Design an enzyme around this catalytic site. Structure first.
Site, PDB file in Angstrom:
ATOM      1  N   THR A 183       0.832  -1.165   0.000  1.00 14.06           N
ATOM      2  CA  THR A 183       0.000   0.000   0.000  1.00 14.06           C
ATOM      3  C   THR A 183       0.867   1.213   0.000  1.00 14.06           C
ATOM      4  O   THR A 183       1.803   1.295   0.739  1.00 14.06           O
ATOM      5  CB  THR A 183      -0.959  -0.042   1.194  1.00 14.06           C
ATOM      6  OG1 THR A 183      -2.051  -0.886   0.856  1.00 14.06           O
ATOM      7  CG2 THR A 183      -1.503   1.313   1.576  1.00 14.06           C
ATOM      8  N   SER A 184       0.521   2.154  -0.850  1.00  8.61           N
ATOM      9  CA  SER A 184       1.110   3.456  -0.845  1.00  8.61           C
ATOM     10  C   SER A 184       0.016   4.461  -0.682  1.00  8.61           C
ATOM     11  O   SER A 184      -0.793   4.582  -1.536  1.00  8.61           O
ATOM     12  CB  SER A 184       1.785   3.687  -2.166  1.00  8.61           C
ATOM     13  OG  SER A 184       2.607   2.606  -2.463  1.00  8.61           O
ATOM     14  N   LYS A 207      -9.038   2.804  -1.571  1.00  7.72           N
ATOM     15  CA  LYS A 207      -8.469   2.961  -0.230  1.00  7.72           C
ATOM     16  C   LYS A 207      -8.744   4.343   0.368  1.00  7.72           C
ATOM     17  O   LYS A 207      -8.375   4.612   1.514  1.00  7.72           O
ATOM     18  CB  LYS A 207      -6.960   2.707  -0.277  1.00  7.72           C
ATOM     19  CG  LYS A 207      -6.603   1.319  -0.786  1.00  7.72           C
ATOM     20  CD  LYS A 207      -5.103   1.107  -0.852  1.00  7.72           C
ATOM     21  CE  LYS A 207      -4.782  -0.268  -1.414  1.00  7.72           C
ATOM     22  NZ  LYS A 207      -3.317  -0.517  -1.461  1.00  7.72           N
ATOM     23  N   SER A 226       3.351   0.270   3.028  1.00  4.64           N
ATOM     24  CA  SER A 226       4.628  -0.382   2.726  1.00  4.64           C
ATOM     25  C   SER A 226       5.445   0.364   1.670  1.00  4.64           C
ATOM     26  O   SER A 226       6.672   0.419   1.757  1.00  4.64           O
ATOM     27  CB  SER A 226       4.390  -1.823   2.272  1.00  4.64           C
ATOM     28  OG  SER A 226       3.486  -1.873   1.181  1.00  4.64           O
ATOM     29  N   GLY A 227       4.764   0.945   0.686  1.00  7.58           N
ATOM     30  CA  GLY A 227       5.432   1.661  -0.397  1.00  7.58           C
ATOM     31  C   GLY A 227       6.023   3.008  -0.015  1.00  7.58           C
ATOM     32  O   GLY A 227       6.884   3.528  -0.724  1.00  7.58           O
TER      33      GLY A 227
END
Ligand SMILES: [Cl-]
Ligand SMILES: [Cl-]
Ligand SMILES: [Mg+2]
Ligand SMILES: [Mg+2]
Ligand SMILES: [Mg+2]
Ligand SMILES: [Mg+2]
Ligand SMILES: [Mg+2]
Lengths: 195, 222, 226, 212, 125, 196, 204, 233, 195, 196
Positions: F1-2, F33, F129-130
């Site tokens: 996910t960014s 999201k 995470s990104g």
């Protein structure tokens, strides 16, 4: 195996060893002799892990018999017990150690003295008036501490041994099927066939 | 941690007749819930009128068959082209298997052929080399589904003669090669219905005094 | 298990295979995985089979009572909200993975829901062990503005991919079509591509083959008069 | 698994069941649990099937080499010790073996050695090994005498395996009987437990708990 | 707060009458007429939609209610009491039957459940 | 996910990728999201999808009940409600939420609530995470009081790089613009942002 | 350790023409030790039959529980419970213990008294219903039973032919399972007569 | 025993009427980090064989050097090294399969899944798989990793059994392979858009295509998808 | 505790239970009575985890005595065994289950029949002609299977029981210090004081 | 640790921070992570300090013996020797090495050898814990055939950001320039790079 006792009296050493062989669930034998004669005046009883006990005992016996033939001479009980200790002390740092505890009862023909040595699987040696391995000492030593005398006869030693076995038969949870008793003195080794 | 073993599924079946023997196996190869191949032969002609299958972990299975075929070759070299008898092959396979007693071939091995009297023979092995001559043996995934059926329909277990009510057993009459193949096909059809790792195809190798013959049959592909 | 959901022009279609398994053994060869929450809200379940059935019937029961209370036909978003809040509360221990589809006064809807209580919106969805095989087909052939006939074809093809390629899936294809302004049509065993071939032999035994020790009549009737 | 062997006036009786299991699954009902080491020596199979088969066949080869070299039949004592010394070398590696090496020679008479994969080697008169050993011991202990006839001793061994086969879930299939004499062992047939049980129940009057 | 009325509000009078039940029946007597007739191949239940005002939309007031797909109910007396009983009856058909046996209750047993609820309002605190 | 949220002159913009993974399998390649908890208070979700959905639904309920009683809530109030749920249930939640909103009094505001349930008011925030791969880029390229077009470019370029390096991120870049003018949704496809 | 294979045992049910059959072994054990050869696993409540495999304490408990519930059912409904209804009751009752389940494998068999239709059903330990047209299997030899039933079964068998099929299915399955056997019972069920037969089998 | 560090994802392949096709993307992942973007995972051996490798990249580079050495060694004292005694696909596979099984047998595996694609001397198609366990199998379509779950179902719709191979042209086969690569890009989180594709044909020989891209992607439908249930805006 | 045996003969039920109580290393007692009279014609023996055995047994005894007083009536052995099974079946899913296995020997005065029930700690009940708990059955069942008859006298039952105890004393590794034997018949419960 | 090597028009430049940590303690704040294995072949070291020193010493020995026999080794040859040690001893090593060198025939070359012992020839490479935070920045800002001054700025700015976000990185930025002209060492202090 289970119970092995030893007592050094005035003129002899007496070794008592249980007769039971138990493989987990069933008692496979009730007449097993947990001892080997190393030389005419030296006897060794043994207890520990299955297989290793007899393997070790017979290996020692073979070595002492070899020495006896080479030199035409019987090693003293002290010398034999030192040889046995070194083998076990060597063994404890091996890939797979011998899990065997022994008592060595011998009559020294030079000194005219009985001698009892207690050696565990680590190579811990002690000379004693009376000894045991495993839990046997926990039940019997209070009786031996009370009654033992260094000037006891062989018959008195056997009577004190009977009291020890009776206390074992009363308070021990396991049925060890009685004991085989052997006497080591100046005339050699003999078995008491009624005990 | 690296796991040197796997499970490629599969089911094999060996039946010894009076003067013949069959070794059958499904042709499906799998890992987990995936199909690797719908046709990957599992039963092999090893020469000298012997057929062999090592079911379970296919890498160990292929290695064992390869080493046995090699053993047959060298048996000829070393012993003046003598034919390797089925009993001799079986003892030889025990030594191949037990040689890796402490890092086993993760397979259930079955060989089939004829003994030195010309009678049908099947031998069955565990992963570490214990073996026995048997009349009937299923191996692998659906072995538990097949063996009870064979006990009942080959050996006539629990079957008694009508009218006697349990007093006289159904007599053990010899089966023809056509009869055995029917039971093999029905065994695998039933196994295919109830076991997810069994299907795609069935390949049967039939051994007689005339040699080794092959038969193939489609199985359900779901 | 392979289950899919596909949106089309005037509604939504869901489909499923008919194989249920314990481990490597097929327990039932013609299992019904399409469950009715309400007349026009249906869902398909993967995972723990008792959980997918139980959670469907509980929410279906509460949806029916809600429909009676409000004098309105049930909505898919209500079923979705009740399902997810129930599943979240049990933190994934109720192993129900569902594709929920239906039509209501608001329109046609397609959602997926996982056992932890996370939800998804989409035009095409797949769940179960054969979902990767099914999604491969969906990703290759799906387009916008599918007709009813095209969506049924795509859905059943996606299930077939699971049937043939996934060992966890097999047997038949069940379909349910939910179109706006129409009765939902449940098509049980829409495809039957796995009929067992005739056996080589009949295994009917001769009468008297089995050894018997005792015989007796079992009284299934109640205590009698007189 | 149930195997037994006992010494008596007429030599040695060896009796075994025939069942092999993998968990609850009955793999075989036709396992040969007596291993014919040579025409004079027998060994029993318990623990690991392969370990027993492999090493007792190997023992047969060592016994053959001994008698070629020494021009004399190997003793049961020597034969059993070759096996026990071998498995003792492998101790810790995971061999599984519980066997009775049975023989009848001039110098020894009928002799049985229990040999075991942790290195145990016991001479004795009666041994019983396996999952059903306790059941067979009961029948053996209460009926055993040295002065049994060959016929009665054979039946006692058969009846003791049957007792185990009945109660122990992992014992059954069929009973294999052997009689070991000084001139070699004699095979006394395979006896299906299913048929044997009913036969014994009727003729003996035992197993009244079971409806027949 | 707390409901401190943990005692019965319906009790026996010296003559053996349960006053509150009699008075409830008097309220029913004042209520609009409803009826039921059983035929060989069906049952009919009917009542008058006594509209309180002509501005009121009487179609939004349901005097005849579906309890299960095969069971219906009508009343005479206090409308609000009926409405909440219908809610409880619909729910109890599920909780005490359909969620257990996977089928709707038979008429007599649903009636029994509704009766039990009404009995309890006659004895509970 | 960014995910990220960036304040600018006219308000705030939220940005996110659309990839949802189960291990290495992309379970949803078109995920949304960017979540609405109130008319002009949105959030970006990272961590457990079940947890962040459950939290967001509860917040939306709380702000709806707040609005009925006390009128429009501030962005700070919304962040506080998020924080209360995340902090008090920290043992049972895996949620990293960025809260972004537009008031007329306060204008654009961004609050980040990391795993522990702490709150941090920032000019802009990145998470998922990104985000690790674009700390350097975002720090070097962020300016305060950017225009709408500049902020869209900043987020587009930032998430482009996050998607490029992070396997857990991908799909489309979604954006939601929060200003006085209203709420605008934007979407950018791979063929656009991959060539940047 | 595994609760479903401590005691052992099997149940199998089959449908025939205007009839159903349900059968079980008689063994109860403590792992390797055989304890009882008279532990019947089939019960009945009116005309509905219930077989239960698995942990024996739960087998007994559930029988008592379903006797309890079907007795109250009958008093209130004024009629005997039907196989279809009872199947739902078993499912409901098992699922209420979702996170502390009875370790059992129940099997329902019977004929609907009004429609005359033969009915069988199976359950996992947690209540999932398997309503097969052909046969249901359960127990420690369920694999073996699946193999036997799949090959031996054919539809529309007459009562006395169905008896032979189900008997041979049970017997040969049990003989390939260490924890099953020690006797067997077969129920042949028709609309208004039920016959119970004890089978002769090997006792090892 | 080790763990893979830098890894390559799926290798996919199938047979068609005159030969075989094999494909693999150009990514070297470092866990979830898409670290290296120009990794060639299809390695040609001569003009008749292409070896496709997935899994640990360091082990791949080792295998690549083994194959390079194999060609050098085969040419030694071999006048027919470019004719009758050239390396066959079957020789190359059997050698690799031997190495793989030996390495797993020493508990020190080459952490890979390998597909050897080629055409034999007699024109026969060769397609066989081997992995870190030494497991081998052949099929009209073969795929590793994610490809096994997603590519195979699609490729099997073209060639479902042996008899479908002669009915499948190189155009239909390549189309199917390229579509499968797109599907994997949609759904595999460790895949990339860039890939290589190799065709080994018995008539036209080895055609090696580099720098291919996944194209014709559907993303437009994403614009209508809002929230996760009840959200309308 | 350890060995508990039961045998139902023609007209009575006989329960034999070991006397030893062992706490790990030492045998603390050799005269322990592992039984409770639940009612005049119903006896229950027990074995399992320390403390729980007696606690459970006395709890059952108290409940059956309470029933007897309330109704002025003795429950049948079947009814008592069902009550006991339910308590154990309830217990196995408790926070801390009773680790207790029991044998219930009763004489039904209505049917004029002896009855023996075997119930383990899970609530597994079986009615048997003869039974045991623990390893006791492994040594004794082959003897009981052979010699048992349903028409045996009490004296013949005691003789078969002696053979079972002898086999236990031979092959069991543990010394259980003999057994206390009690007979349940139409006249009630009595103890055989020489065994 | 934050390390990188970048090829440019006149050759190659290696860059590194100077922080060495034992947990949260900085055991050395002035470490030299740029190591000479030959006159114009250097390397950047990350991972176990013991391992990377041991490897580098062995490589230096190998290239010294190579030079005595066969003359100056190529950068590819040096990378191959590094790879041989890292690959064959992968079970017992934790080493991530970037090899950079200048030939006259090949000019500037960069090889990266990550944990597994694979080799990757690249225009530029980044490694160490701090590199994660500058993947986005470096990808956006790297150009081929930069000048010496541009490459120094690129590395200075990149490592500045890596140091800013990574606690395991810090101290001074060291650089070594490899060209035909020779070998030049550069150092940049916190007060310089922190204000960038
Ligand atoms: Cl953060
Ligand atoms: Cl890297
Ligand atoms: Mg199948
Ligand atoms: Mg959670
Ligand atoms: Mg048995
Ligand atoms: Mg990405
Ligand atoms: Mg059985």
């Amino acid at each position: 195996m289970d119970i092995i006792l030893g007592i050094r009296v005035q003129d002899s050493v007496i070794l008592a060893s249980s007769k039971a062989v138990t493989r987990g669930i069933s008692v496979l034998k009730d007449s097993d002799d947990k001892t080997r004669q190393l030389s005419p005046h030296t006897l060794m009883s043994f207890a520990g892990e299955a297989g290793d006990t007899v393997q070790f005992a017979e290996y020692i016996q073979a070595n002492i018999q070899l020495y006896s033939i080479r030199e035409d001479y019987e090693l003293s009980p002290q010398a034999v017990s030192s040889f046995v200790r070194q083998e076990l002390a060597k063994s404890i740092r091996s890939r797979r150690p011998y899990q065997v505890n022994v008592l060595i009862g011998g009559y020294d023909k030079k000194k005219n003295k009985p001698e009892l040595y207690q050696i565990d699987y680590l190579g811990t040696k002690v000379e004693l008036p009376y000894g045991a391995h495993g839990y046997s000492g926990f039940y019997t030593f209070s009786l031996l501490d009370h009654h033992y005398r260094p000037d006891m006869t062989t018959e008195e030693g056997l009577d004190l041994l009977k009291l020890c076995v009776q206390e074992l038969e009363k308070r021990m949870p396991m049925d060890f099927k009685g004991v085989i008793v052997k006497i080591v003195d100046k005339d050699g080794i003999r078995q008491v066939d009624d005990f | 941690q690296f796991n040197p073993y796997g499970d490629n599924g599969g089911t094999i079946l060996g039946i010894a007749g009076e003067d013949f023997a069959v070794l059958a196996g499904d042709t499906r190869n799998i890992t987990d819930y995936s199909i690797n191949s719908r046709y990957e032969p599992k039963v092999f002609d090893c020469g000298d009128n012997i057929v062999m299958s090592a079911n379970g972990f296919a890498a160990d299975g292929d290695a064992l068959v390869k080493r046995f075929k090699n053993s047959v070759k060298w048996y000829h070299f070393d012993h003046n082209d003598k034919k390797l008898s089925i009993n001799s092959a079986a003892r030889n396979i025990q030594h191949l298997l037990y040689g890796k007693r402490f890092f086993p071939y993760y397979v259930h091995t079955i060989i089939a052929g004829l003994d030195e009297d010309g009678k049908g023979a099947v031998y069955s092995f565990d992963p570490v080399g214990s073996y026995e001559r048997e009349q009937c043996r299923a191996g692998g995934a659906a072995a538990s589904l097949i063996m009870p059926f064979l006990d009942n329909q080959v050996n006539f277990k629990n079957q008694y003669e009508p009218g006697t009510n349990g007093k006289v057993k159904k007599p053990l009459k010899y089966l023809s090669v056509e009869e055995v193949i029917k039971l093999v096909r029905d065994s695998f059809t039933s196994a295919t219905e109830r076991h997810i790792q069994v299907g795609d195809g069935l390949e049967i190798l039939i051994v007689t005094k005339d040699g080794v013959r092959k038969e193939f049959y489609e199985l359900k592909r779901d | 298990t392979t289950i899919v959901g596909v949106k089309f022009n005037n509604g939504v279609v869901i489909a499923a295979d008919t194989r249920s398994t314990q481990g490597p053994i097929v327990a039932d060869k013609n299992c019904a995985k399409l469950h009715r929450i309400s007349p026009k809200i249906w869902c398909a379940g993967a995972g723990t089979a008792a959980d997918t059935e139980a959670v469907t019937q509980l929410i279906g029961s509460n949806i029916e009572l809600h429909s009676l209370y409000t004098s309105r036909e049930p909505r898919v978003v209500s079923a979705l909200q009740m399902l997810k809040q129930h599943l979240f509360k049990y933190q994934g221990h109720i192993g129900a993975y569902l594709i929920v589809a239906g039509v209501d006064p608001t329109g046609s809807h397609l959602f997926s829901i996982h056992a932890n209580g996370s939800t998804d919106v989409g035009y095409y969805l797949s769940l179960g062990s054969g979902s990767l095989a099914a999604m491969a087909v969906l990703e290759s052939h799906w387009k916008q503005d599918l007709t009813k006939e095209e969506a049924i074809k795509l859905a059943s093809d996606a299930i077939q991919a699971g049937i043939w390629n996934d060992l966890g899936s097999g047997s038949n294809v069940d379909v349910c079509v939910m179109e706006i302004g129409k009765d939902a049509e449940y098509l049980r065993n829409y495809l039957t591509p796995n009929v067992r071939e005739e056996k080589q032999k009949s295994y009917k035994f001769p009468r008297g083959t089995t050894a018997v020790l005792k015989e007796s009549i079992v009284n299934i009737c109640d205590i009698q008069e007189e | 698994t149930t195997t037994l062997a006992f010494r008596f006036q007429g030599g040695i009786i060896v009796a075994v069941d025939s069942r092999a299991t993998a968990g609850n699954w009955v793999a075989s009902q036709t396992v040969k649990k007596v291993i014919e080491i040579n025409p004079f020596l027998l060994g029993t199979m318990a623990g690991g099937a392969a370990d027993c088969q492999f090493w007792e066949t190997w023992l047969g080869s060592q016994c053959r080499l001994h008698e070629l070299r020494e021009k004399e039949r190997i003793s049961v004592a020597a034969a059993s010790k070759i096996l026990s010394n071998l498995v003792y070398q492998y101790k810790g590696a995971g061999l599984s073996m519980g066997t009775m090496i049975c023989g009848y020679t001039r110098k020894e008479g009928p002799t049985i050695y229990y040999v075991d994969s942790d290195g145990t080697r016991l001479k004795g008169d009666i041994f019983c090994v396996g999952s059903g050993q306790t059941f067979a011991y009961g029948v053996l202990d209460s009926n055993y005498k040295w002065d049994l006839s060959v016929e009665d001793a054979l039946y006692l061994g058969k009846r003791s395996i049957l007792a185990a086969a009945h109660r122990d879930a992992y014992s059954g299939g069929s009973v294999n009987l052997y009689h070991v004499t000084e001139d070699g062992w004699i095979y006394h047939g395979n006896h299906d437990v299913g048929e044997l049980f009913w036969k014994v129940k009727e003729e003996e009057g035992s197993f009244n708990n079971v409806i027949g | 707060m707390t409901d401190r009325y943990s005692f019965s509000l319906t009790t026996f009078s010296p003559s053996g009458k349960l006053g509150q039940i009699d008075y409830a029946l008097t309220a029913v007597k004042q209520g609009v007429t409803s009826l039921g007739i059983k035929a060989t191949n069906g049952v009919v239940i009917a009542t008058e939609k006594k509209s309180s005002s002509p501005l009121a939309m009487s179609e939004t007031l349901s005097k005849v209610s579906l309890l299960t797909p095969d069971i219906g109910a009508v009343y005479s007396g206090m409308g609000p009491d009926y409405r909440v009983l219908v809610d409880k009856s619909r729910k109890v058909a599920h909780t005490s039957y359909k969620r257990i046996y996977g089928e709707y209750p038979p008429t007599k047993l649903l009636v029994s459940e509704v009766a039990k609820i009404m009995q309890e309002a006659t004895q509970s605190g | 996910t960014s995910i990220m949220a960036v304040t600018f002159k006219d308000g705030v913009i939220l940005g996110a990728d659309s990839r949802t993974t189960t291990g290495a399998y992309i379970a949803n390649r078109v995920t949304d999201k960017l979540t609405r908890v109130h008319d002009k208070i949105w959030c970006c979700r990272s961590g457990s999808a079940a947890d962040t959905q459950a939290i967001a639904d509860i917040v939306q309920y709380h702000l709806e009940l707040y609005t009925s009683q006390y009128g429009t809530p501030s962005t700070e109030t919304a962040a506080s409600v998020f924080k209360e749920l995340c902090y008090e249930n920290k043992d049972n939640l895996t949620a990293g939420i960025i809260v972004a909103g537009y008031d007329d009094k306060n204008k654009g505001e961004v609050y980040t609530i990391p795993l522990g349930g702490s709150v941090h008011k920032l000019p802009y925030a990145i998470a998922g995470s990104g985000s690790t791969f674009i700390y350097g880029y975002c720090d070097k390229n962020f300016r305060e009081n950017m225009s709408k077009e500049e902020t869209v470019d900043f987020i587009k370029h930032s998430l482009s790089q996050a998607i490029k390096w992070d396997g857990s991120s991908g799909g489309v870049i979604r954006m939601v613009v929060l200003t006085a003018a209203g709420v605008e949704r934007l979407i950018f496809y791979p063929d656009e942002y991959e060539q940047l | 350790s595994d609760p479903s294979s401590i005691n052992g045992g099997i149940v199998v049910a089959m449908t025939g023409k205007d009839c159903v059959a349900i059968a079980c072994d008689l063994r109860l054990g403590s792992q390797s030790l055989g304890v009882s050869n008279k532990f019947e696993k089939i019960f009945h409540y009116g005309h509905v039959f219930l077989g239960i495999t698995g942990l024996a304490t739960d087998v007994t408990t559930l029988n008592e529980m379903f006797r309890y519930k079907t007795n109250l059912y009958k008093l209130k409904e004024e009629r005997a419970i039907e196989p279809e209804t009872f199947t739902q009751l078993v499912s409901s009752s098992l699922y209420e213990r979702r996170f502390g389940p009875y370790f059992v494998g129940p099997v329902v068999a019977g004929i609907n008294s009004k429609s005359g239709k033969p009915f069988i059903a199976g359950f996992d330990l947690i209540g999932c219903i398997d309503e097969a047209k052909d046969f249901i299997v359960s127990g420690t030899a369920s694999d073996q039973l699946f193999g036997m039933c799949e090959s031996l079964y054919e539809p529309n068998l007459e009562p006395e032919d169905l008896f032979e099929t189900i008997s041979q299915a049970l017997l040969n399955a049990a003989d390939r399972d260490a924890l099953s056997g020690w006797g067997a019972v077969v129920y042949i069920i028709k609309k208004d007569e039920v016959v119970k037969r004890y089978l002769k089998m090997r006792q090892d | 025993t080790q763990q893979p560090i830098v890894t390559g994802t799926s290798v996919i392949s199938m047979k068609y009427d005159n030969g075989v096709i094999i494909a693999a993307d150009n990514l070297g992942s470092y866990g979830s980090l898409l670290r290296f973007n120009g990794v060639e995972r299809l390695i040609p051996v001569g003009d008749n064989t292409v070896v496709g490798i997935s899994g640990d990249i360091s082990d791949m580079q080792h295998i690549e050097r083994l194959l390079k050495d194999l060609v050098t060694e085969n040419a030694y004292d071999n006048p027919l090294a470019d004719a009758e005694e050239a390396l066959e696909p079957s020789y190359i596979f059997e050698y690799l399969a031997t190495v793989m099984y030996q390495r797993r047998s020493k508990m020190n595996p080459l952490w890979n899944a390998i597909i050897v694609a080629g055409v034999q001397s007699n024109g026969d198609q060769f397609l066989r798989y081997v992995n870190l366990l030494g497991v081998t199998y052949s099929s009209p379509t073969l795929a590793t990793g994610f490809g096994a779950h997603m590519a195979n179902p699609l490729l099997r719709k073209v060639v479902d059994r042996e008899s479908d191979i002669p009915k499948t042209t190189v155009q239909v086969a390549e189309e199917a392979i390229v579509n499968a690569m797109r599907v994997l890009y949609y759904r595999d989180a460790r895949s990339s858009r860039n890939f290589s594709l190799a065709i080994i044909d018995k008539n036209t020989g080895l055609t090696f295509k580099k720098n291919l891209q996944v194209e014709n992607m559907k993303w437009d439908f994403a614009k209508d998808i809002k929230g996760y249930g009840t959200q309308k805006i």
